[PDB]
């Protein structure tokens, strides 16, 4: 009838590295869709979703997990940035728009949206009360107030018809580096029962993200170049340096998580990507040396004493 | 108040007195003017207005959090908030911050300053008293950075009326 | 099936002078449209565009390159000013409007827009955190937040139907004289993998822009006057003075890049443009002397000590 | 096929006095519509209009010239006040509205608007950075940003269909008494190649505006009274006093340019305009004496020492 | 603090002391009060409040960037921000800026001033002391602009208690 929590985790393991806790938590949530629905009239409506709060750093998987999950469950999905509702002035800038947008992405399938729609509210830690530079704080407290109706259960009007939000699963996220989840408003706090933590990614993890996942960056570039009649191969050592470099600059400058891998690969596949058409029939071996040459030396300075006395 | 920090032999220490005085009368003699920030991996000691100090401290902590906890970068960004048109109110306090890499003193007016060579910092009314005892101790002894701090604080305390003997010394292994 | 990176650069070389790095970077991007699409179902969707950030001064080519490229690829194209979204109050003042505008310029061809639409986000360095005169900074940080959805991949509703932004190529630009690209928000920073630098233009380049490019200013005026039955010809020396003058005033006053050439030519072709109808059958020779007379002497003052003590 | 620059100036000379430079500049612009269009596919699209900036005082002709020109070229025309776009809140308060308004005034004739529409942006010197009383300066810089798209070449949607602005001619104006044209933003500055200066009007010019132009004020009042069966005639001396008075009050009080003539004539034709019906068959001679009586004596005071110590 | 600049023989120099003092006590004696701006093609030296100086410096740098790095124009635009209704807070500091063309002194109150003839500028508490030694050196010697600066700074330092001997001299080839 449907996958079990152990099966769902394995499906996610093919696209995501680490983050066992987050994977586990969403598998339980998806399985509960199936559990109720096996129930009878009375309870089937009384039993509601146990929404999630994923706390964790930038680019470490919080969205991929949510996105992959909806994909494996063929559930209407939607991601929105908490802050986008700071201030409003017209219809489309209201929280209710989250449901219309979701219904519009499923072609109006109302039964679909109600039964198993998923809404990912990114950066909810941004609409709290952090720092003193809090100009319009009533605004942020306000959007928390605007989400309540949705998470607590209500009906919104769409050009496709009325849609209830009683059984839509909600997943929120944040790094919460300054704010804590306890800072949210009581009503919201109680509607996000489950809190899962996602950890930062190490170089060892970077190395695995590079090759293990289905359609990894290394697999993508192999197929892209194969198109131009070029055959490329990454050695174990090469992968390891690409991951060290990525983890290295995320650490010395701005940390963007696994996205850094994309930045580095591009800086690495720069040359071949341009000359691939002129190298048909050949095979290129990307080894340690090739990587140390391509990835030059130490990003760019570290200056900052210009402001110090 | 007296706060001093010494860095030698791969060891960083930051300590201070405990006397809290209202005018010419003492109120508390057991205050902790040195505390650990960012997962307890950065030392911070403060001096000045009780309220201004805490707000300078707090403001700095938010910074460490918005970065990978890099002392220098954080200090520079915090100070930048005073170098603009929006006259961010000034705080009558000072901070001494350190970790395995650097040691800095930050002021509520908006500037960051680094040591000199002997890696010694000191702020507060009793600062320069502990400072001398420390420079002396460093250029003529083999005493640990932890020993120098305690010894200089004590000295400072016997000279400044607003500095007592109830120390709080933190060091970063 | 389609041009190669080396071919595309040559096509661009016919309209743009210099800026090899920027040309190279967009050729690689356009070629990747073709590379994927040669892939199979799984990867074909997983592989996404590597967006670009062109850093460079005013009027040195950043837009012409983007514009020419879309032209040679017959791709739905659109340019917008980052700042235009500072504050919003109605539907049309929202970032989502970028996609509707793009879809509207292609007559609703949804497959076209999704497959190879191009969006040029001009002056993105303006929505950062520069100078102290930052009144509404939350506003600028805000539009960065508004672009994320688009660059990260989402669906927007247009009167023509739903359109995905997963494969639209995005090119952003800036001079970044005060701000740095690292000032953008992490999410955006990671989605603009490639950073190309475009350099200022020298007099030597000016001289080449005047004649080499297809439909250059010298070729345009030759054809315009030919219409009135007049035959004009620019000598090598003449071209050289026009370029020196242009580079000269951009340097002493306001620097507008290659646009200055247009200002100077107009100031030069002033007389002939008016009397062309009365000179049919004749031929005019624009040489050094003709240019030194037409372009008078030194723009206008250099005053400024009026404010000095 | 169409008038030449010398012919166009003569057509304008019948309605406008002085302002040779401005007349000359717009004749060249109109003639270039005809020049390209005689070109072949490639260039015909690459060659674009050389927009104008008319600097000059109040009521000295800047709009009449633009207006007359469009009239003699039967070109869709439109005038708008730069400042009208200071702040926006709804569709109609956006710069794009300039094109819809223009398309609406030509009954949707899209080919007409694109080929030779003319847009006169009045008081562009108002959206600069003048005086210290600059409250919302970002606003003014903002509209300059909003015009760029239009002047640089783009497409706007109208209820009549899509319309390109690539070949619409743009004429901007200002007195620039405090601001300079160099204060505009680089992009705009480079798109307004031609700068023509229009001078103030002297009494001698006033005298000529009174009679020479087709349908001058003196010719209008002659025809108006003729309607009531009255025959009026202005002597040379009379005209001269009307012009002196007009130039006189523009100089001692507020200077409104040639508009002052209308104010004075009305103050002069006050009586006859009322009794014309009772004077049929008669003929009135407006001479020096009639004017000195009608135009009383010295406007009204010159007080101002009320505020001085 | 003492900062002086001399321009002679197609050479421009700008140097200053290194003493940073809090009240009547020194804090650091190795500060760099002279630095290079705009791709290192313009010299700048500052005096006054440690925080106010840096913000005056920074504000000026943003200017050079918004123009083709033209010293004069930049100075005039920065000063214009004080000559309006919006009472842009005043900074208690001063700057000496120079390059291959001109030399100016800009103040945190909003005015720009040019030399006089001998192309000599000087600001700070010790300014006029280095100023005299320099005028003297220029109207009676053949010494390089680089030599005059070092010699005058030293002199100034032996007179002003807030000016030490740890110089930082920058010259524009
Ligand atoms: N743990 C992980 N395993 C595989 N890929 C990852 C992982 N974490 C992040 N990524 C990749 O990095 C990019 C950023 O993903 P994202 O979900 O937005 O992180 P987050 O939700 O914390 O902002 C994605 O393209 C994703 O494929
Ligand atoms: N490198 C170049 N080669 C040929 N023409 C150029 C070049 N750079 C600028 N131009 C011309 O100058 C004008 C300004 O172009 P633009 O692309 O807006 O520069 P930018 O993108 O930096 O603002 C255009 O009409 C273009 O033809
Ligand atoms: N040089 C002129 N010759 C004839 N009439 C003029 C002249 N200048 C202004 N006028 C008249 O004065 C009135 C103001 O015209 P206007 O074009 O708005 O001046 P501007 O463009 O400077 O504001 C118009 O009715 C016009 O007929
Ligand atoms: Mg994220
Ligand atoms: Mg984030
Ligand atoms: Mg004591
Ligand atoms: Mg540009
Ligand atoms: Mg610009
Ligand atoms: Mg007017
Ligand atoms: Mg006016
Ligand atoms: Mg001294």
CATH number reported for the structural domain that contains residue E171 in this entry: 3.60.20.10
**How far off is chain C from E26, nearest CA to CA, in Å?**
31
Q: How many domains, chain B? A: 1
The 3-state secondary structure of A238-266 reads HHHHHHHHHHHHHHHCCCCCCHHHHHHHH
**Quick check: helix, strand or coil at residue E43?**
strand
Closest alpha carbon within chain C to B85: C132
Residues B43 and B45: their CA atoms lie apart, in Å, by: 7
Ligand that lies nearest to the alpha carbon of residue A209, given by its number in the listed order: 1
With tokens 């079990």, the residue in question is A4
Q: Is C266 exposed, middle or buried (0-12, 13-18, 19+ CB in 10 A)?
A: middle
Residues C208, C194, single domain; the answer is no
Measured between its terminal Cα atoms, the distance across chain B in Å is 25
Q: How many domains, chain C? A: 2
Size of interface C-D (CB pairs under 8 A): 94
Q: Which residues contact A43 (CB under 8 A, 6 or more apart)?
A: A36
Residues C2, C68, single domain; the answer is yes
Choosing from A151, A169, A198, the residue where a domain stops is: A198
Helices (H), chain D: 5-13, 20-35, 41-46, 62-72, 97-104, 110-116, 137-152, 186-191, 203-211, 217-227, 236-252, 259-268, 270-275, 288-294
Measured between its terminal Cα atoms, the distance across chain E in Å is 25
Closest alpha carbon within chain C to E58: C131
The H or E element containing residue C270 is: helix C270-275
Question: Looking at ligand 1, which atom is closest to the CA of residue A173?
Answer: 21
Residues A52, A154, single domain; the answer is yes
E25 tagged catalytic: no
How many CA atoms, within 13 angstroms, populate the side-chain half-sphere of residue D290?
19
Phi and psi dihedrals of D157, rounded to 5? -90, 125
Q: Which two tokens stand for residue A72?
A: 């494996």
Residues E42 and E99: their CA atoms lie apart, in Å, by: 5
Give residue D116's Cα distance to chain centre.
Answer: 19
Residue C255 with chain E: CB contacts under 8 Å: 68
Are the beta carbons of A232 and A286 closer than 8 angstroms?
Answer: yes
| Ligand 1 atom 12 nearest Cα | A258
Q: Which two tokens stand for residue B143?
A: 């005493």
Q: Which residues contact D46 (CB under 8 A, 6 or more apart)?
A: C215, C220
Cross-strand pairs, A197? A55
The H or E element containing residue C283 is: strand C283-286
DSSP class per residue in E14-34: EEE---EEETTEEEES----E
Under the phi-then-psi rule, with left for phi > 0, alpha for psi from -120 to 50, and beta for the rest, what region is B113? Answer: beta
Residue C133 with chain B: CB contacts under 8 Å: 85
User: Residues C295, C249, C308, CA angle at the centre, nearest 5°?
Assistant: 120
Closest CA to D270 of D214, D216, D225: D225
Distances (CA, A) of D57 to B168, C300, D22, D68, D131: 76, 21, 13, 19, 19
How many CA atoms, within 13 angstroms, populate the side-chain half-sphere of residue B167?
25
**Quick check: helix, strand or coil at residue D180?**
coil
> Considering only residues 47 to 66 of chain E, which have any Cβ-Cβ distance to chain B shorter than 8 Å?
49-51, 54-55, 58
Residues A286 and B52: their CA atoms lie apart, in Å, by: 57
Distances (CA, A) of B172 to B62, B165, C81, C228, D200: 21, 22, 50, 85, 79
Closest CA to A218 of A159, A268, A146, A175: A268
The answer to whether E54 contacts A309, with C-beta atoms less than 8 Å apart, is yes
Does chain B touch chain A (at least 3 C-beta pairs within 8 Å)? yes
DSSP class per residue in C223-281: HHHHHTT-EEEE-HHHHHHHHHHHHHHHHHS---TTHHHHHHHHHHSHHHHHHGGG-TT
With tokens 């007379």, the residue in question is C293
The response to whether residue D64 sits with its C-beta less than 6 Å from ligand 3 reads: yes
Q: What dihedral do alpha carbons A71, A72, A73, A77 form, nearest 10°?
A: -10
Q: Tell me which residues have their CB closer than 6 angstroms to ligand 1.
A: A 16-19, 56, 58-64, 209, 213, 257-259
| Ligand 3 atom 15 nearest Cα | D59
Are the beta carbons of E99 and E41 closer than 8 angstroms?
Answer: yes
Closest CA to B96 of B171, B3, B13: B3
**How far off is chain A from B65, nearest CA to CA, in Å?**
6
**Quick check: helix, strand or coil at residue C252?**
helix
With tokens 């990307």, the residue in question is A286
Sign for the pseudo-dihedral over CA of B110, B114, B116, B120: positive
Residues C222, C191, single domain; the answer is no
Task: Give D257's DSSP letter.
Answer: T
Q: Which two tokens stand for residue B20?
A: 């809290």
Q: Which structural technique was applied?
A: X-ray
Pick from D258, D265, D266 the residue to mutate for probing ligand 3's pocket: most ligand atoms within 8 Å of its CB: D258
Does chain C touch chain D (at least 3 C-beta pairs within 8 Å)? yes
**What is the greatest pairwise CA distance in chain E?**
48
CATH number at residue A284: 1.10.8.60
Residues C174, C227, single domain; the answer is no
CA of C123 to the centre of ligand 7 (A): 7
Say yes or no: B84 contacts chain E, CB-CB below 8 A: yes
Choosing from C171, C198, C225, the residue where a domain stops is: C198
Question: Looking at ligand 1, which atom is closest to the CA of residue A60?
Answer: 8
Residues C229, C90, single domain; the answer is no
Residues D258 and D256: their CA atoms lie apart, in Å, by: 7
CA of C108 to the centre of ligand 9 (A): 42
Could you count the other beta carbons within 10 Å of the beta carbon of residue D268?
23
| Ligand 1 atom 14 nearest Cα | A59
The H or E element containing residue D195 is: strand D194-197
**Residue E136 domain boundaries:** 1-173
Are the beta carbons of B100 and B172 closer than 8 angstroms?
Answer: yes
CA of A122 to the centre of ligand 1 (A): 13
Q: Which two tokens stand for residue E122?
A: 């000087």
Residues C206, C185, single domain; the answer is no
Are the beta carbons of A57 and B65 closer than 8 angstroms?
Answer: no
Residues C99 and B16: their CA atoms lie apart, in Å, by: 60
Residues D30 and D72: their CA atoms lie apart, in Å, by: 10
Residue C38 with chain A: CB contacts under 8 Å: 227
DSSP class per residue in A154-217: -EEEETTEEEE-TT-EEEEEE--SSS-GGGS-HHHHHH--EEEE-PPP-HHHHHHHHHSSTT-H
**Quick check: helix, strand or coil at residue E97?**
strand
The H or E element containing residue C195 is: strand C194-197
**Residue A244 domain boundaries:** 201-305
CA of A58 to the centre of ligand 1 (A): 8
Are the beta carbons of A61 and A22 closer than 8 angstroms?
Answer: yes
Q: Which two tokens stand for residue D247?
A: 């130039």
Residues D286 and D234: their CA atoms lie apart, in Å, by: 5
Residues C105 and C109: their CA atoms lie apart, in Å, by: 9
With tokens 């049919």, the residue in question is C280
CA of A240 to the centre of ligand 1 (A): 19
Closest alpha carbon within chain B to C135: B86
Question: Looking at ligand 2, which atom is closest to the CA of residue C67?
Answer: 17
C interface test, pick of E54, E55, E66, E97 with most C CB neighbours within 10 Å = E66
**Quick check: helix, strand or coil at residue D303?**
coil
* Resolution, expressed in angstroms to one decimal: 2.5
DSSP class per residue in A102-151: HHHTTTT-HHHHHHH-EEEEE-GGGGS--SS--SSHHHHHHHHHHHHHHH
Q: Which residues contact A132 (CB under 8 A, 6 or more apart)?
A: B59
**Quick check: helix, strand or coil at residue C156?**
strand
B interface test, pick of E50, E51, E82, E93 with most B CB neighbours within 10 Å = E51
Long-range pairs of C90-93 with CB within 8 A, sequence gap ≥ 24: C90/A89, C90/A90, C90/D89, C90/D90, C90/D91, C91/A90, C91/A92, C92/D91, C92/D94, C93/D88, C93/D94
Are the beta carbons of B156 and B7 closer than 8 angstroms?
Answer: no
Choosing from C198, C215, C245, the residue where a domain stops is: C198
Residues D7 and A138: their CA atoms lie apart, in Å, by: 67
Closest alpha carbon within chain D to C133: D138
Question: Looking at ligand 2, which atom is closest to the CA of residue C258?
Answer: 12
**Quick check: helix, strand or coil at residue B67?**
coil
Phi and psi dihedrals of D303, rounded to 5? -45, 155
Q: Which two tokens stand for residue E116?
A: 């006089």
DSSP class per residue in E106-125: EETTS-EE---SS-EEEEST
Angle between helices C5-13 and C20-35 (to 10 degrees): 140
Residues A122, A22, single domain; the answer is yes
**Which stretches of A40-112 are assigned E, i.e. beta strand?**
52-55, 77-81
Residues D188, D220, single domain; the answer is no
Residues A89, A169, single domain; the answer is yes
Residues B95 and B56: their CA atoms lie apart, in Å, by: 8
Residues C113 and C103: their CA atoms lie apart, in Å, by: 6
Q: Which residues contact D153 (CB under 8 A, 6 or more apart)?
A: D48, D164, D165, D166
CATH number at residue D127: 3.40.50.300
**Which stretches of C8-105 are assigned E, i.e. beta strand?**
52-55, 77-81
Residues B63 and B44: their CA atoms lie apart, in Å, by: 13
| Ligand 2 atom 20 nearest Cα | C59
Q: Which residues contact D181 (CB under 8 A, 6 or more apart)?
A: D53, D55, D174, D189, D192, D195
Q: What share of chain C is helix, strand, coil (3-state, %, to 5)?
A: 50, 15, 35
Say yes or no: E59 contacts chain A, CB-CB below 8 A: no
Residues A56 and A235: their CA atoms lie apart, in Å, by: 32
Q: Which two tokens stand for residue B24?
A: 């010419």
Residue B85 with chain C: CB contacts under 8 Å: 132-133
Residues E110 and B116: their CA atoms lie apart, in Å, by: 34
Residues A185, A56, single domain; the answer is yes
Residues E116 and A287: their CA atoms lie apart, in Å, by: 66
Q: What share of chain D is helix, strand, coil (3-state, %, to 5)?
A: 50, 15, 35
Strand order in the sheet with D194-197: D77-81, D118-122, D169-174, D52-55, D194-197
Residues E116 and A203: their CA atoms lie apart, in Å, by: 62
Task: Give D181's DSSP letter.
Answer: G
Q: Which residues contact A52 (CB under 8 A, 6 or more apart)?
A: A25, A26, A29, A169, A170, A171, A172, A192, A193, A194, A195, A196
> Considering only residues 83 to 112 of chain E, which have any Cβ-Cβ distance to chain D shorter than 8 Å?
83-86
Are the beta carbons of A304 and B72 closer than 8 angstroms?
Answer: yes
Closest alpha carbon within chain D to E87: D132
Does chain D touch chain B (at least 3 C-beta pairs within 8 Å)? no
Residues D184 and D181: their CA atoms lie apart, in Å, by: 6
Q: Tell me which residues have their CB closer than 6 angstroms to ligand 2.
A: C 16-19, 56, 58-64, 209, 213, 257-259
Are the beta carbons of D139 and D84 closer than 8 angstroms?
Answer: no
Residue B112 with chain A: CB contacts under 8 Å: 307-309
Residues C184, C215, single domain; the answer is no
Residue A130 with chain B: CB contacts under 8 Å: 62
Residues E73 and C268: their CA atoms lie apart, in Å, by: 29
Determine the length of chain B.
173
A64 is known to lie in a ligand binding site: yes
Q: Which two tokens stand for residue E74?
A: 């930049």
Residues E171 and E146: their CA atoms lie apart, in Å, by: 7
| Ligand 3 atom 11 nearest Cα | D258
């Amino acid at each position: 009838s449907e996958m079990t929590p152990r099966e769902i985790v394995s499906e996610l393991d093919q696209h995501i590295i680490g983050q066992a806790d987050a994977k586990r938590a969403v598998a339980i949530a998806l399985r509960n869709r199936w559990r109720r629905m096996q129930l009878q009239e009375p309870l089937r409506h009384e039993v509601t979703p146990k929404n999630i709060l994923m706390i964790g750093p930038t680019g470490v998987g919080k969205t991929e997990i949510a996105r992959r999950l909806a994909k494996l469950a063929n559930a209407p999905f939607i991601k929105v940035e908490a802050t986008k509702f700071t201030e409003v002035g017209y219809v489309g800038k209201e929280v209710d728009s989250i449901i219309r947008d979701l219904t519009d992405s499923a072609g109006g399938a109302i039964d679909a949206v109600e039964q198993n729609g998923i809404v990912f509210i990114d950066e909810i830690d941004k609409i709290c009360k952090k720092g003193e530079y809090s100009g319009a704080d009533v605004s942020r407290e306000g959007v928390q107030r605007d989400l309540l109706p949705l998470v607590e259960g209500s009906t919104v009007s769409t050009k496709h018809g009325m849609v209830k939000t009683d059984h839509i699963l909600f997943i929120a996220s944040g790094a919460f580096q300054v704010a804590r989840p306890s800072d949210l408003i009581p009503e919201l706090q109680g509607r996000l029962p489950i809190r899962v933590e996602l950890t930062a990614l190490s170089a060892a993890d970077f190395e695995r993200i590079l090759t293990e996942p289905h359609a990894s960056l290394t697999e993508q570039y192999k197929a892209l170049m194969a198109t131009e009649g070029v055959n490329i191969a990454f050695t174990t050592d090469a992968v390891k340096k690409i991951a060290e470099a990525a983890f290295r600059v995320n650490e010395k400058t701005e940390n963007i998580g696994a996205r850094r891998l994309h930045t580095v690969m591009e800086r690495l596949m720069d040359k071949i990507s341009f000359s691939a058409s002129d190298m048909n029939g050949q095979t290129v071996n990307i080894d340690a040396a090739y990587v140390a040459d391509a990835l030059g030396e130490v990003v760019e300075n570290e200056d900052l004493s210009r402001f110090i006395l | 108040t007296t706060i001093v920090s010494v860095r030698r032999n791969g060891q960083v220490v930051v300590g201070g007195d405990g006397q809290v005085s209202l005018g010419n009368t003492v109120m508390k003699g057991n205050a902790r003017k040195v505390r650990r920030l960012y997962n307890g991996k950065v030392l911070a000691g403060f001096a000045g207005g009780t309220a201004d100090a805490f707000t300078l401290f707090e403001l700095f902590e938010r910074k460490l959090e918005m970065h990978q906890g890099h002392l220098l970068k954080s200090a520079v960004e915090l100070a930048k908030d005073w170098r603009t048109d929006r006259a961010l109110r000034k705080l009558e306090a000072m901070l001494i911050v350190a970790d395995e890499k650097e040691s800095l003193i930050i002021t509520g007016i908006g500037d960051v300053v680094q040591p000199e060579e002997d890696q010694i910092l000191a702020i507060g009314s009793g600062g320069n008293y502990a400072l001398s005892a420390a420079r002396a101790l460093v250029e003529n002894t083999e005493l640990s950075a932890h020993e120098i701090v305690e010894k200089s604080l004590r000295i400072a305390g016997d000279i400044c009326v607003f500095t007592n003997t109830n120390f709080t010394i933190e060091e970063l292994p």
